[PDB]
């Protein structure tokens, strides 16, 4: 009767619904009883410190468990042959065959092999022993506590910031650009120059010797002379053995381009110069806004002045400043959309341009990292549109936004939604149509009647970057071009070596199979956008519920009248777009993994011929690569892929259990539960025990959330088991 | 009483829990400790030496496996990466123990932060610097053997390192401090 | 493994006693009128 202490409406519910709903509403502080705006920003401030500490505790644990139970020191000696260890296994359910099957990694105990790539990241940035891995763990344990204390401290009466502080847009932007982004990019440049690059060259540099070991022989004298190019002199030779002194240069700031020939990773001196340059640019950016000394910009002034005089945007951005500052959901949506794009850039640029030594020869790590971050990207992208829907319902005031860009969006929302509807159908009819054409034509023994479109636009873009594979002879591929001649003294020689070797993933060769899947990925991006945009733009009202904003973000329906109104809320379009987000990241990660496993075998022609029809995806990708995974145990034994073989079935089970919450709805279940309530009261020796909360069927919205979670969890566990075990089992 | 082979941490308790007022008795309990900060730095350095030296047979055992193989190649990368990591760490720690053993407390930070202009006596003028020279020559031998393809050369050179490091510890008799 | 006894101590406690105690005490908190 007191668990939802933030909600008197739930704490007076006599059912089991109170426990469920109190847990699901706990972090929605805006809806809690008696919430002021002061307290809302102060609880968010403290719980951001608490989240930060969780990230530091998660990182310290990964460092600690590798220092304690890993084979980091053995892996560092021979990184292409040793398989990195994540942590050890202590499971009393194991048989003795399982204990033996997991005793790989060069150790005497059951262990889990790591797919996270943390060995390659810690090696590349300098870590060499277990003792500095543990030193880093200790620092993060300290940092987590410092941020736990800071969270508690800024909840104290004297240290609780005012709303005027929380809404100082110009001072926060100045510090986050120049200090949080810019200075720490500069400080990371310092770490590479002072530690990572010297230890890539055999020389240990730690806290013990850093103040007496110069990063450069000349040493901070060329910098204070303008002879900056003296720091690019003598780069690492192509004979350099990473981690040792042989083949090593003395440069600390280069723009060579391409990959270190032995690690197949970006040069550490390119990376240090990247972070120095980015850091300088960001620090300059962090001086844009006026804080206390009369120079800089008012953000309000810039937005008000950007109304095009032709009048096509109406009042322009007048009143957007107040709308964004007052709406945390508008801020969250911008942050998640921006974060969602970056984590997709991270996935794309880390497989094509790897920075860590000897990664991209770890096919399991390379596959898991891509899959992980595209799935994070799809979740972040859904959340941005969901919180844009929450903004319009809850935080958008149409009278402070008269004729804005925001109000004019809502004025032509049917133009936007119907044109997404057309482009989704346009992509879907023909992308599926060509694939079905190709399947039918290949099934009838006539693969030469397939519709095979060459992706010339992308091939021309590859050639513009110097790819000499399609004879396009444009820009960088052209020998005598203004573009090619301009970059020739810097990165062009190294980049052309990197992009015209067929031994990496920089601008991979593409054909008709890649054309077809990109248009499928285009179909899924526009269709997911459609559901989410329709959810955001119809959130305030529609023709079925013109007063939909009076009911909130998540409500079950408006009942069976007016034809029926199931899934009419803006929340329900988040629900529906979650299936389309899972489908799209499936299409993306299925494509990435099949294209890579066929290349890693040396059989890229298997992808080239089989990707143009759907049976090629079914038999040559899903069915063919299933066999090491589903043989992780059998009546003839088990091996270390037994855990992924079990997670695979586990994922199919959770996914299918979600169907029960999504297909069968409440009325069936409430009537069963009434027969169970009767039987308990009538059964002797059992009616001595009484529920405190009346057992009820899950709510309409809750079952959608429970089924969505089960569907989503089953989706993730199945693919992760497949993408890791099929890659592990093949090694190629 | 000695240093753990793999961890390099003070292992034996030394059988010294004396509260003993008046004479401190070097009571290993803190606030009864008679050890200087310099002694504690010396035990850390000796622990580093133990980890490196115990790791020396790992290279010796790995090199023996390499030589035994159907076709022998003497992984120059492994031998060099051992030398770049474990072997160099040995030499620098041995040099630092010599520095403290010769100049004295100034090397413990008495003269300040490590500087490009260290205002103290160098690692020379130490009776145990000769052992540091032995390890330095051995590192050169390890690299030279790896470039040449000599399996026996790597094994003998690593053995030279092991004897020299053990000799260093015996002459130094590093104070075992548990505080 | 160093301190090899720790998994056989901490895993049953973390995996059985820790949930057994939070479920026991959460149940009391969610089923109290005051």
């Amino acid at each position: 009767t007191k668990f939802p202490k933030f909600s008197q409406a739930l704490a007076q519910d006599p059912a089991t619904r109170r426990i469920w709903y109190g847990l699901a509403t706990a972090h929605d502080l805006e809806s809690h009883d008696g919430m002021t705006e002061e307290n809302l920003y102060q609880k968010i401030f403290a719980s951001h410190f608490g989240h930060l500490a969780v990230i530091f505790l998660w990182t310290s644990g990964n460092l600690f468990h590798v220092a304690w139970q890993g084979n980091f020191e053995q892996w560092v000696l021979n990184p292409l042959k040793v398989k990195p260890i994540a942590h050890a296994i202590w499971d009393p359910h194991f048989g003795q065959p399982a204990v033996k099957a997991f005793t790989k990694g060069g150790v005497s105990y059951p262990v889990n092999i790591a797919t996270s790539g943390v060995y390659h990241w810690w090696y590349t940035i300098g870590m060499r022993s277990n003792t500095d891995l543990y030193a880093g763990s200790l620092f993060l344990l300290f940092l987590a506590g410092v941020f736990l204390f800071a969270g508690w401290l800024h909840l104290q009466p004297k240290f609780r910031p005012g709303l005027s502080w929380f809404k100082n847009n110009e001072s926060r932007l100045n510090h986050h650009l120049s200090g949080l982004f810019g200075f720490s990019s500069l400080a990371w440049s310092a770490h590479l120059i002072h530690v990572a690059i010297p230890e890539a060259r055999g020389q240990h540099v730690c806290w013990d010797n850093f103040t007496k070991v110069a990063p450069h022989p000349a040493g901070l004298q060329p910098f204070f002379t303008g002879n900056w190019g003296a720091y690019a002199a003598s780069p690492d030779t192509t004979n350099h053995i990473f981690g040792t002194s042989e083949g090593a240069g003395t440069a600390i700031l280069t723009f060579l381009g391409g990959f270190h020939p032995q690690t197949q990773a970006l040069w550490l001196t390119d990376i240090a110069h990247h972070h120095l340059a980015i850091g300088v640019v960001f620090i300059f950016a962090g001086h844009m806004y006026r804080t206390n000394w009369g120079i800089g910009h008012s953000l309000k002034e810039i937005l008000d002045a950007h109304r095009p005089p032709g009048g096509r945007l109406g009042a322009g951005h007048k009143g957007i400043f107040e709308t964004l500052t007052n709406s945390l959901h508008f801020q969250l949506g911008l942050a998640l959309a921006s974060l969602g794009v970056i984590t997709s850039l991270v996935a794309q640029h880390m497989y094509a341009l790897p920075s860590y030594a000897f990664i991209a020869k770890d096919y399991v790590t390379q596959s898991a990292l891509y899959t992980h971050h595209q799935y994070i990207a799809g979740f972040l992208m859904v959340g941005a549109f969901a919180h844009g829907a929450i903004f319009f319902v809850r935080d958008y005031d149409p009278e402070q936004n008269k004729n804005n860009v925001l109000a004019r969006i809502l004025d032509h929302k049917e133009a936007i939604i119907s044109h997404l509807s057309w482009v989704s159908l346009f992509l879907g009819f023909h992308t599926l149509g060509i694939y079905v054409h190709n399947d039918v034509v290949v099934a009838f023994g006539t693969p030469e009647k397939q519709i095979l479109v060459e992706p010339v636009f992308a091939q021309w873009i590859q050639a513009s970057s110097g790819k000499a594979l399609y004879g396009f002879d444009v820009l960088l591929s052209s020998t005598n071009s203004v573009a090619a001649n301009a970059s020739s003294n810097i990165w062009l020689p190294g980049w052309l070596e990197a992009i015209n070797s067929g031994k990496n993933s920089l601008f991979l060769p593409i054909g008709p199979g890649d054309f077809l899947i990109h248009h499928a990925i285009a179909l899924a991006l526009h269709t997911t956008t459609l559901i989410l945009v329709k959810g955001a733009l119809d959130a305030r009202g529609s023709k079925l519920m013109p007063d939909k904003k009076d009911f909130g973000y998540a409500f079950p329906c408006d009942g069976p009248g007016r034809g029926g109104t199931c899934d009419i809320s803006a929340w329900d379009a988040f629900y529906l777009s979650m299936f389309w987000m899972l489908n799209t990241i499936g299409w993306v990660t299925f494509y990435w993994h099949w294209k890579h496993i066929t290349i890693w075998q040396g059989n890229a022609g298997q992808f080239n011929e089989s990707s143009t029809y759907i049976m090629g995806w079914l038999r040559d990708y899903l069915w063919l690569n299933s066999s090491p995974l589903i043989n992780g145990y059998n009546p003839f034994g088990m091996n270390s892929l037994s855990v992924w073989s079990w997670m695979f079935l586990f994922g199919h089970l959770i996914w299918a259990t979600g169907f029960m919450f999504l297909i069968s709805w409440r009325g069936y279940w409430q009537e069963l539960i009434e027969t169970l309530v009767w039987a308990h009261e009538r059964t002797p020796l059992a009616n001595l025990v009484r529920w405190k909360d009346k057992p009820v069927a899950l709510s309409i919205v809750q079952a959608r959330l429970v089924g969505l979670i089960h569907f989503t969890a089953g989706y993730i566990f199945t693919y992760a088991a497949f993408v890791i075990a099929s890659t592990t089992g093949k090694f190629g | 009483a000695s240093l753990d082979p793999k961890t390099g941490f003070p292992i034996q308790g030394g059988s010294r829990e004396k509260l003993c007022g008046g004479s401190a008795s070097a009571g290993c309990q803190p606030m009864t400790q008679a050890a200087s900060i310099l002694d504690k730095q010396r035990t850390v350095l000796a622990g580093k030496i133990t980890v490196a030296a115990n790791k020396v047979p790992v290279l010796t055992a790995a090199v023996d496996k390499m030589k035994t193989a159907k076709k022998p190649k003497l992984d120059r990368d492994y031998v060099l990466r051992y030398s770049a990591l474990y072997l160099t760490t040995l030499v620098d720690a041995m040099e630092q123990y010599c520095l403290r053993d010769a100049n004295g407390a100034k090397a413990a930070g008495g003269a300040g932060l490590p500087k490009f202009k260290e205002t103290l006596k160098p690692a020379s003028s130490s009776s145990l610097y000769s052992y540091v020279d032995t390890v330095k020559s051995g590192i050169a031998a390890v690299s030279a053997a790896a470039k040449a393809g000599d399996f026996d050369g790597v094994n003998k050179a690593a053995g030279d390192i092991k004897t020299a490091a053990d000799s260093f510890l015996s002459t130094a008799n590093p104070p075992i401090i548990f505080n | 493994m160093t301190a090899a006894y720790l998994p056989s101590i901490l895993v049953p406690i973390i995996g059985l006693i820790f949930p057994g105690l939070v479920m026991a005490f959460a149940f009391i908190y969610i089923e109290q009128d005051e």
Partner: peptide, 30 residues
């Protein structure tokens, strides 16, 4: 390698974090 004493240092510092996490959580709970 890591000594058991070093593991015990980590358990002390993580305990300090557990105590600070409780206090931050109680402050957030009010």
């Amino acid at each position: 390698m890591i000594s058991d004493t070093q593991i015990f240092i980590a358990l002390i510092l993580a305990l300090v974090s557990l105590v600070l996490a409780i206090r931050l959580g109680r402050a957030l709970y009010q």
